[PDB]
Amino acid sequence: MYTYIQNFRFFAGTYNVNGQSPKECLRLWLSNGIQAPDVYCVGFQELDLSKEAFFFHDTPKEEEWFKAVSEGLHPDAKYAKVKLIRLVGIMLLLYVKQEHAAYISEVEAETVGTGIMGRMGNKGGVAIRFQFHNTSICVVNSHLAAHIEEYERRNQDYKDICSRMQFCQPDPSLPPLTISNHDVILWLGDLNYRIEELDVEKVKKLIEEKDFQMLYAYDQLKIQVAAKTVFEGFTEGELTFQPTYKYDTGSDDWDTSEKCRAPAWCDRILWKGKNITQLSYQSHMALKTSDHKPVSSVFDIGVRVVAHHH
Ligand SMILES: CCCCCCCC(=O)OC[C@H](COP(=O)(O)O[C@H]1[C@H](O)[C@@H](O)[C@H](OP(=O)(O)O)[C@@H](O)[C@H]1O)OC(=O)CCCCCCC
Ligand SMILES: [Cl-]
Numbered sequence: 643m644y645t646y647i648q649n650f651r652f653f654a655g656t657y658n659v660n661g662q663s664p665k666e667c668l669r670l671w672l673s674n675g676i677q678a679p680d681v682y683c684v685g686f687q688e689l690d691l692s693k694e695a696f697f698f699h700d701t702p703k704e705e706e707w708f709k710a711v712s713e714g715l716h717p718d719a720k721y722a723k724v725k726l727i728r729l730v731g732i733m734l735l736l737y738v739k740q741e742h743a744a745y746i747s748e749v750e751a752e753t754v755g756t757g758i759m760g761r762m763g764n765k766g767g768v769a770i771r772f773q774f775h776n777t778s779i780c781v782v783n784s785h786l787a788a789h790i791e792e793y794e795r796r797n798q799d800y801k802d803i804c805s806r807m808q809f810c811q812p813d814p815s816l817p818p819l820t821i822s823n824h825d826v827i828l829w830l831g832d833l834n835y836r837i838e839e840l841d842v843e844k845v846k847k848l849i850e851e852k853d854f855q856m857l858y859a860y861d862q863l864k865i866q867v868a869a870k871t872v873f874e875g876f877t878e879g880e881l882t883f884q885p886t887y888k889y890d891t892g893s894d895d896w897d898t899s900e901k902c903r904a905p906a907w908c909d910r911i912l913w914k915g916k917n918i919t920q921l922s923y924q925s926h927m928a929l930k931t932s933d934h935k936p937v938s939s940v941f942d943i944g945v946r947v948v949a950h951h952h
């Protein structure tokens with residue numbers, strides 16, 4: 643057989659929904675003035691903040707948000723639901739245009755909790771891996787530890803998801819699949835990294851000034867990536883949108899509660915692999931159900947397709 647590179651459009655979305663049910667149309671996130679994607683990868687955090695969900699019960703939030711995503715996908719294509727995976731409030735959905743579904747195989751999904759006692763699902767990651775034509779792809783959705791001062795725990799949460807996440811395989815001879823053994827890796831989530839050093843007032847001023855390059859020099863993820871403690875070999879696109887946390891629900895105002903939180907680029911998308919180009923990296927201010935804003939990225943990804951023999 644012969645293979646060649648064919649480009650496909652992948653949308654990746656992350657949204658911390660602060661335990662709410664969906665109240666708004668999700669087109670503003672999922673299909674807001676873009677071409678119909680070939681593949682949709684849509685991730686949530688804090689789908690359900692209840693004690694019942696914490697002890698691993700089913701939640702109606704799963705279907706509510708799944709239906710809401712399905713209704714917000716681009717109207718020009720019928721999308722096939724490939725896979726859903728959830729651990730407590732961390733949920734990842736994979737859809738492909740119907741015409742591409744026959745070329746999806748080896749779908750596996752797994753979860754790793756890294757929250758309470760290093761094991762519960764209040765924080766952690768979920769992942770769907772699959773083969774599209776002859777290219778292997780792993781999409782990870784993580785919710786890492788909160789708070790400015792817990793950066794080391796975030797680093798450790800990342801390492802723990804990487805070491806413990808194992809996928810089934812067709813061959814039991816071989817060692818199980820890890821996240822890193824894929825041609826393409828897309829990692830998204832509420833990674834929860836904050837702005838070091840600067841005080842809340844200085845952070846908010848820089849944002850009003852739109853000096854994102856300067857604010858970014860103090861971003862914990864940037865610093866940790868430079869120090870090689872996390873996301874080794876991954877790329878993130880330039881942040882040109884304002885911090886996505888923390889807002890008063892129903893508004894675009896910064897948190898006016900007692901905790902008065904410092905803004906942060908909590909919500910991030912990164913990637914690793916050959917033949918990837920980022921076409922966009924954006925937040926979506928118009929959605930106000932949550933104290934976070936959703937984030938999206940569209941990629942052109944080269945996929946190995948089998949040439950037809952005649
Ligand atoms: C093995 C059994 C042991 C049980 C021990 C009980 C465990 C417990 O109390 O905390 C569990 C978690 C604690 O939040 P945690 O994940 O750090 O989540 C973050 C914090 O709430 C943080 O304040 C907030 O930031 P903000 O403040 O900046 O917005 C972030 O949005 C959150 O991501 O709360 C939950 O997940 C909610 C469900 C817990 C129910 C259990 C009650 C007994
Ligand atoms: Cl918007």
Ligand SMILES: [Mg+2]
Pocket residue numbers: 660661688
């Ligand atoms: Mg919350």
